[PDB]
Amino acid sequence: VIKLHDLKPAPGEKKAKTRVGRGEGSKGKTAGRGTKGTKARKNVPVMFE
């Protein structure tokens, strides 16, 4: 008799979110952006060369 606590997502379904800028153990002080530039703070439009 399956009850509500017996329910479980299929293996491989749920991936953990990557929380960034939460220490130097994973992704810190730049959050995967590298050093300065345009790309260090905003973006570049896809139609720009």
Partner: protein, 100 residues
Amino acid sequence: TYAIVKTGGKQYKVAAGDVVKVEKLDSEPGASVSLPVALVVDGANVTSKADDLAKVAVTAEVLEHTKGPKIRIHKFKNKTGYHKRQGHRQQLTVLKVTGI
């Protein structure tokens, strides 16, 4: 008399009754191990020749298995942001030597 046992890649000076903390040995506690010798001193004469040093072994009994001191490692390099923590406890056996 007293001998110098070889065990765990290390040499320990030993006399009958001495207790020594050596590296891990595969022997359940209570069992008796036999260990080779690097030197024997009986009174005023020593056994240094290789063949007749191989003729004598030191018989000891295992009292327990022990964990070494807790060692904490925190590798760190400045201005790079690089840290690395880990720990180590070494596994050991306590030997009460009985005969030489």
